[PDB]
Each structure stands twice: as C-alpha cells, then as structure tokens.
Amino acid sequence: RRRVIGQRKILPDPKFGSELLAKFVNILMVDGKKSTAESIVYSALETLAQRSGKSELEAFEVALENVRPTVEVKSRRVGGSTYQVPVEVRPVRRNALAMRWIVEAARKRGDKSMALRLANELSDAAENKGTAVKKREDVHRMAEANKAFA
C-alpha cells in the first residue's frame, strides 16, 4: 500500500547521554510515570557486583554487544498456501529486542525488589545462561532447518 512514514529516534537519557538507556527506560515504563524507571535501572552497581558482574564497562553492555538477534518466526503465505518461515529482524530493533526479553523476565519473576530482580537478570545474562540468550538460540536453531522461503 501507500506510506512511507515519519519516524522518531527519541531523546538521550539526561544523566548519561545514552539513547540506548533511554529506549531501555521506555520499555521499562509502566503506568506512564517514567521517572520511576530511572530509579530501577542503572541505580546501583553494588547489586551486580553481588553476583557475576565484572567492572562497570560491562554494567549495561551485557544487553548490547553480548548478543546479536537476526530472525523472528511465525508463518507467511507463498502462492496459494501458508508455511512456517523465519523473517529478517529490522536493523534498529536489532539492538532493542533483547531489552523486552530482560524486562519481561525480571517483571514476571516472583522475588520482591524490582531493582534487584533487574540486576539479577543482568547477572544471568553476563553468564550467558537461559533467559533472553536461549530466546535468540531457539529461533536460530529453527532457521537452520527452514531455508527454502524468505
């Protein structure tokens, strides 16, 4: 169809000058309050240095350069019929997709302090185990047995 649309790249964070931290607090934004999210993420290092977090240069990069998503699953129509087909992840959600996989895994966990649930979820990404890193692997293992369509 028509359009061709205008797009937004959002303001950087007012303490660190990071637009990646800004997109993280936007995915961490519930009930529209937005100041609450600043007090949950990057509000302590003493809770990452409590588990697997090694030096501050990795206190956020464990969600950025530690992973590379490429594809998403579901079905697509080709000619007269529908098939299961892996689709090419878009190049600006590429670096902001794992943010939902970390925020959801912490938000839905039953373990009290949310600022500590998030630091513990970042520690469990710094070991490269289970949550978020297997949600990347599961669809790549699927796409290594599904190649005929794009």
Next chain:
Amino acid sequence: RIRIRLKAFDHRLIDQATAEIVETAKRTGAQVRGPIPLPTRKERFTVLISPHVNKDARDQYEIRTHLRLVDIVEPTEKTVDALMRLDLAAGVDVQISL
C-alpha cells in the same frame, strides 16, 4: 456612583447597544472611561439529536451570556438621566446598580 447591567445573548447586539448608551452619555456631557467587556459566560450540552434511537446521532450545542456594567465614577446627576429611560436594540435587558 452608578453601574448599568446591560446583558444579551449575542456579541454584536451588545456592541450596537454600547454604541447607543455610551454615545448618549458623551452627547449629554458625562465624564466616562472605556467600558469593560467582562469574561463571557457559557452554557453547553451534547445530546442524542435523532427522533428514535440511531445511537451515532449525538451532537454538541452551546449558548453565551454577555454582560457589561458601563460604570460611572462621577456623582453628576443631569449627565446620566438621559440613559435610564433610553431605548436599546431589541432583546437586551437592563438593571441599575451601585
């Protein structure tokens, strides 16, 4: 001192009445200032405006009450007697106050 509560439901009717009472005041030699316009007061509603059901047919209506006071500061009596029995544009109401 006197004030004259000149009220109407239309923004031109009150200007065409101001152009009669303030001109009568100046031509009768009254010492007068520029009269205040006052903040407009409103009444509004949105209702189902179709004769039988047809629930999409909800429409907005509004009506506006305009008031001026004229306000005479000077105690002179002969200069303002020409205003109290004066005829103004049809549909306006007048009441005299302090």
Next chain:
Amino acid sequence: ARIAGINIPDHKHAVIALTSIYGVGKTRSKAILAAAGIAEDVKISELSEGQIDTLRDEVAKFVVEGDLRREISMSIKRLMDLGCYRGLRHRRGLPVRGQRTKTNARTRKGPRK
C-alpha cells in the same frame, strides 16, 4: 505461642504476621501497643512478668473464637423459625442481598460440573 494455653515460648512478632489467629483480629493489634507505650518492632524478648500477657486478654476487647460463635448464635435461631422470610431464605439454596437470579448466581446457589 504464649498468647494461647499454658505454653511459654513467646519469641514472635507482636503485630507482623499475627493476624486472624488466637482471637487476634487484623487492626486493633497495632493500636493496643501504641496506647500501652510499647514499641511493636523486633521479636518480643523484654516484656516479661505480665507486661504483654495482660494486653492479650483485651486485644480481643470483645468475645473471640468459640465464645464469639456463641455470641453470633444469640440471634441466629430466628433463622430456624422457618415461617419467617430470613429463615426461609436460609433453609433454601439462595442469597438474601446483593445477588440476581441468572447473572453471577452460581457462587451462592451451587456450582456447575
């Protein structure tokens, strides 16, 4: 639980997690200690020789437990007169206020499957 029977172990919280047990309610348990000039924080260790046992009688500023079910029963045998409207609604599988006949009714009439 020194609050009940002849037992003497009392190293518990006096307002936290002390709710709906031993005749304790849910809100008077806080006010009775403040009005006695007692701090409610930290597990009890320094309130010996009747200093909190004296208040556990009146926390509990009315009849509790098996003597409260006795008290509620002083007007309940009216429901066993059966000719009376409230009693007839109590022998039947029905509500008596704030519920309708087919919209959200199974929670008092009885479940399906």
Next chain:
Amino acid sequence: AKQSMKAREVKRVALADKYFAKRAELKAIISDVNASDEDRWNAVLKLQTLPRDSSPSRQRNRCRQTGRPHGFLRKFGLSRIKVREAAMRGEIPGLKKASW
C-alpha cells in the same frame, strides 16, 4: 403519557404551598440529637404527618409541549427532539445551529 400525570402534579404543587413552600427548613426547630428527651414542638409534627397527597417526591418535569417524561431539557421546558426544530424555526432566543 396519560394527560392526568401533569394535571395532578400542578394540584400537588398548589398543595405543597401550605406544607413545604418556605417551610422545608421548618424541621430545624424540632430536630435534635437528644433534647433532654423532653417534648415541646409537637405542634409542628401534627401538620408534617397530616398530608399524604403532597410529598418531596412523585414529580416528573416533562416537556411543556409533550407529556413525555424522558429526553427533557429543564431550562427550556422542551425536549432533545424539539429544540433543534425550534432553533431552526426561530422560536427561541439565544440558541442557533451551525455557523457559529
């Protein structure tokens, strides 16, 4: 709407004129939280328990051109299915449609 519903209400308003009109605060000389449990104002209550056909209820504003109770606009005395006719027929001051 049966025509008796307004024809009876006008007679009830004329009857409230001896019991409630400038007398709806008259309870303020017999109401008390205790009064030492005495009785000295029953001269008011003998007349407040007298009427039955007049009351602070049983009234419906209706339209001054149709006996219909619902769809009414109090300050005009007309309906939501009559003011759009009147405002285009030029029968009411201050009110108009469109422009504005």
Next chain:
Amino acid sequence: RSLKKGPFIDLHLLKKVEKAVESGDKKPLRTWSRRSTIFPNMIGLTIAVHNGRQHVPVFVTDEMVGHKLGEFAPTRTYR
C-alpha cells in the same frame, strides 16, 4: 432496632379481631396491606393475604407476632 424509635402503624386491622373470632366456618378475614405489623393479641387467627394474583390463608403464630404480615406470605410465582 427498627426504623425510628416510633413505629409507623394503623389500627384498621386490629379493630376487626373481636368479630373475626366468631366467623364460624366462613372463609377467613381478607387484607391487602402487607407492610402492617402483627400485634401479640392477633395470635390464633386465620387471615387471607395477597400473593400477587390471588389471596392465600396464613395462621397467626408465636413466630409471626412482633413482625410484619408480608414477611410470612409468598410474593412470587413458579411455586
């Protein structure tokens, strides 16, 4: 603990009892007001009360006295 310290009452039915105790085998004394209270000296009498389409008989007992008449009689159908 009833609504106000003074009860709202009318003696229009109590005034019939000294004649309703000599009715013989005739059909019982019939009434339409159901909000009416039943006084203790109305005990041992049969009364016919409106069910919403007919009138049905009730006998005044030590469970009915001190309460309203309508609390002892049916008001709806499907029974």
Next chain:
RNA sequence: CGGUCCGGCCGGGAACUCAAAGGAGACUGCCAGUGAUAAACUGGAGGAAGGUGGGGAUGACGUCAAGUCAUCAUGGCCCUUACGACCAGGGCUACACACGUGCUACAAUGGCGCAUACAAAGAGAAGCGACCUCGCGAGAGCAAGCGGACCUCAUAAAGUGCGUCGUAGUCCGGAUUGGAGUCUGCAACUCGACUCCAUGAAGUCGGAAUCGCUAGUAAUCGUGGAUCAGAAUGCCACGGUG
C-alpha cells in the same frame, strides 16, 4: 511611575500575560527540479504557518418501499360506563436453564503514613456552605463569604523524598456475615443509601482461541456536572504523567 499595615494592599496603568475589539495574512504567487518550457506535482525562500493547511458546514439525477404512529398532525378500522383511571396491595431486579461484554485483584516498578510541587474546567440564594463544635465516623449544630477573576463545594492525585512489610496461597486483595450507629421519606418487609467495631473464603497475572490500538495514539491518575427527596459502576465535559 508614586505610597509601602509592608500586602496589588492603595494612588495609578494597559506592559509578557489575562479579558475584549480592530487591521493585516496565503495566491501555486515566488525560486529550483520534473512534465507536451501545456496542465500539474515535490521541495525550498519568506512567514506564526500552507499547497483538498486543520476544524465547522451545504447534499445534482439516482439508492435502502431506509427509520417512527412508544413524541405529533391527519384519513381509515376499533373503542367511548370502556382498552376511561384514582385508591389499598402490588408488577417491570422473573427463572429448576445457555451466552456475551466490561470492571478490579493476584501484589513489593506493591501497600501505607509523614514530609513535598503544579492544576484546569465546572457547579451553587429557603443554594454551595467556610472558621468553630460533638463523635473514630456516617452526619448534626454554630455561623461568614459568593452570583462569577477579593467565596463555598475543594490541602489536585498519580508522582518526588524516607522508613517499613517480604510468596505466606500474605497487614495484600475480595465475596459473605454478627453487633452498633448516621440519613431522606406515607412508607426503608418483598423493597434504599452511608459509617464504625467483630469475621474475613477466592485470587500463582490465566489454555486452545478471539478482540482492539499507529503519536500526544496506547496506557495511567485526579477534578467537575446532568438525571437527582434519598438512592448507578452508566453518561457529557476539564486537566496532569506519557
């Protein structure tokens, strides 16, 4: 610019504002690229800003014999002691029975108290009802201000700060319930609202499947009013966070 109960409180004034009015302003005209240097388009310059700017608003012949006699006029058919309609009861929240649609929790980016900041638009004279009083309270008295920018309803809330509870089917969160009170009304059975002690069941954020939203849009919290004796969660409007 003067006074300086030190306060727009006054003398006074029309300055961002605010409340009001008047005059300009936008035409593809100006410039480039495109295209029969035709028509016409996308951008750029100016400018507060365009290119059916945005919002209101008119309905060519032809459609759906569109909708409504439960809102009227008026012909026909019917009634006219009746299908008239006033009383004492009352019906319209039926029901042994199937299904939608919407709200709020399950908590700890939560719950609570104290400290802490900004409203906006409405409504209101036998009205809204301040300061003050009794009671934990519903609420009842005492008694000003205000008819619209020196009042009342009415400390804006979510938020910001700090301490604290911590999966226990929990002070969370909710159905049901005993006792005692507060209120308008012939009337508070069937068949009303509100407050406080006493009791507190479920609830693990939901499975196939199905539904909706594209930027100040989704989501989130608060203010107000109409109907309105007393009584909806519904409804028509106004702001904050985003």
